[PDB]
Design a protein around this ligand. Structure first.
Ligand SMILES: [Ca+2]
Ligand SMILES: [Ca+2]
Lengths: 49, 50, 38, 49, 49, 50, 212, 53, 106, 38
């Protein structure tokens, strides 16, 4: 097999929900309290949320 | 919970039952058969005509 | 913030470099965070 | 982790059964990636047996 | 908490397949009699009460 | 046959109106709605070149 | 005609991504390794990398090159500057788009690396690379002679067979080298011929899609 | 330091018994012990798919 | 870290060569146990590399046409953290306490 | 004739080179067979 992965949907100081695509063995967990990074510095500008 | 039962082989008619776990609520189970086929393993030998 | 490995300096982008690479006259961070206040 | 954790009815069936014990994990602080844990491929383990 | 003419519901735990005990409530003793049944789980994740 | 989509215009998939050296993101918008298509390969191979 | 087969990757660009084991630490790398597939027999792996191969920095065709991304600016080197290894050195065959075909021995990781004027780029990922013999005599390097058997190797040419990978719109990549300080305000200089957008919470909530 | 994380074991329950299907990615210690006066501990290194009752 | 006279310089090796102290940059020095290693930093007589396990260690640099090397039979070893015995550290997982060499020269 | 590998082009001398090296602009076969009929 081949575990397919989706690109991470980041909302800067908001909240997200789970939209099922009904793909096989599909998991969708949503993680709060993130501070992500790109090569060009920080992505969001909040500390939490 | 392994539950075994038996259904008559007759289409159209709903078949009803329940599952009584000894200290819990009864769980009703309904099976209504619609279309029951029987497909043999069919092996062509030849055709004919006029 | 804080690097996981103890003797490291953290760039602007989160990349950890050694602490002896900060203020050395050579760019190592994206946009020179080790080359700001020397 | 065994034979037939992936079950497609024909070779080009476009409907597959997947039971691969896929679990999503929490990403590292300051990193955009999707971490996951799952049982390894059972077709490879069947080729090993 | 007791009302004037209401009915108070308690929760208890037992090992008895035919439990019967005198329930003391603040002056008086009432007899509680019944027939318990086996639970649904074999192995649980909390110790015994 | 199989008719692809760019608007409410069912055009033949081997006959594109545009090219990639002309439009930067309209060939991309044509390949947007045409992912679920049995003639995606025909559409793309005819739609890159002139 | 090979350009009718390269025409798909004219539509795309290389990108930078996260490599947990770079030349010094854990960086953002031009040569991030998405996957390694090694299911053929006689030592052939198939890397899916973050770079692209067989295309030059404009979008035309050149023979043996790697087209990677570098902080936005898409640069290139010849393919014989790139080396990789598992436990021994491997040998690159060719590339096509996001993929590469090496001839690797067995090991427990892949390390692709190339070198600029002085900056050395690398990416190591803990992906097992396995070596599979044919038949019933277990070798590790294939022999000089013998008999021939029906094996399965990765094909050496790009050709449209029924297996596709999926493209998407890229997101917005925050870039620091744009925002600068004037005397009292915040100066944003978007790159030429390219829009941007700025989001601040210095006063209230803010959004502005500025174009050049 | 970042350490890996093994796949979730597949626990099957029975009357006074726990079975464990264990598919490891790389070799992994399974350390069991009873919560009584005799713990009867079991320190084992499992490297392959293995069922432990 | 020193120049060929005695003052600061960023990423360089300083070595005695039959009396006359010379220097080269530190990206010209390679070393390998079994696989190639990666030099992080140097400070005085000491160097901080990142090597995989192997039963020897070889350091070598190259002059214009003269190659210098030293191999010693010292076991270089790799140590996982926790109850999973990886050989290369992973891409993700639960954070755990460890004890590594500090990068700075404090 | 034919190469054993699934996608390789056979030169005059029998050396198999990959298929995308045929008519690419660089000499690969001895005497360049790959660079004859483009
Ligand atoms: Ca520096
Ligand atoms: Ca050629």
């Amino acid at each position: 097999y081949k575990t397919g992965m989706d690109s991470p949907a980041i909302k800067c100081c908001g909240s997200q929900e789970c939209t099922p695509t009904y793909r096989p063995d599909e998991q969708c967990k949503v993680f709060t309290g993130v501070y992500p990074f790109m090569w060009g510095g920080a992505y969001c500008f909040c500390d939490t949320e | 919970y392994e539950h075994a039962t038996t259904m008559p082989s007759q289409a159209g008619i709903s078949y009803n039952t329940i599952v009584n776990r000894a200290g819990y609520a009864p769980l009703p189970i309904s099976i209504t058969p619609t279309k029951i086929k029987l497909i043999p393993t069919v092996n062509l030998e030849y055709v004919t005509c006029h | 913030n804080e690097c996981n490995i103890p003797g490291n300096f953290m760039c602007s982008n989160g990349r950890c470099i050694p602490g002896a690479w900060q203020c050395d006259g050579l760019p190592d961070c994206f946009d020179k965070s080790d080359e700001k206040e020397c | 982790g065994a034979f037939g954790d992936i079950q497609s009815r024909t070779v080009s069936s476009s409907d597959l059964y997947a039971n691969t014990n896929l679990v999503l994990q929490r990403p590292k602080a300051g990193a955009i990636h999707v971490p996951y844990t799952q049982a390894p491929s059972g077709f490879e383990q069947w080729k090993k047996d | 908490e007791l009302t004037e003419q209401g009915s108070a519901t308690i929760h208890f735990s037992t090992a008895n397949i035919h439990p019967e005990f005198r329930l003391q409530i603040c002056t008086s003793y009432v007899t509680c009699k019944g027939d318990c049944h086996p639970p649904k789980d074999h192995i649980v994740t909390h110790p015994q009460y | 046959t199989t008719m692809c989509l760019l608007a409410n215009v069912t055009f033949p998939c081997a006959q594109p109106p545009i090219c990639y050296d002309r439009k930067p993101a309209e060939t991309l918008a044509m390949l947007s709605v045409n992912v679920d298509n049995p003639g995606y390969d025909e559409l793309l191979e005819a739609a890159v070149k002139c | 005609s090979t350009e009718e087969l390269f025409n798909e990757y004219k539509l795309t660009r290389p990108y930078m991504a996260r490599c947990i084991r770079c030349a010094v630490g854990s960086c953002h790398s031009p040569i991030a390794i998405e996957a390694v597939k090694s299911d053929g027999h006689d030592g052939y792996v198939r890397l899916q990398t973050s770079s692209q191969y067989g295309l030059d920095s404009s979008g035309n065709l050149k023979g043996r090159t790697m087209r990677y991304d570098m902080h936005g600016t898409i640069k290139e080197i010849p393919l014989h500057q790139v080396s990789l290894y598992t436990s021994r050195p491997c040998h690159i065959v060719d590339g096509h788009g996001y993929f590469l075909l090496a001839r690797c021995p067995a090991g427990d990781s892949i390390t692709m690396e190339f070198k600029k004027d002085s900056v050395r780029h690398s990416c190591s990922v803990p992906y097992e690379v396995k070596f599979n013999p044919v038949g019933r005599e277990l070798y590790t390097h294939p022999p000089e002679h013998g008999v021939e058997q029906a094996c399965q190797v990765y094909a050496h040419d790009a050709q449209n067979r029924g297996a596709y990978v999926e493209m998407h719109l890229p997101g917005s990549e925050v870039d620091s080298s744009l925002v600068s300080l004037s005397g009292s305000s915040v100066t944003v200089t978007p790159p030429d011929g390219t829009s941007a957008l700025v989001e601040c919470e210095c006063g209230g909530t803010k959004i502005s899609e500025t174009i050049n | 330091c970042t350490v890996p994380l093994a796949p979730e074991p597949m626990i099957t329950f029975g009357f006074r018994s726990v079975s464990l299907k264990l598919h490891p990615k790389n070799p992994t210690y399974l350390i069991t012990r009873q919560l009584a006066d005799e713990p009867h501990y079991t320190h084992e290194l499992i490297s392959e798919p293995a069922v432990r009752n």
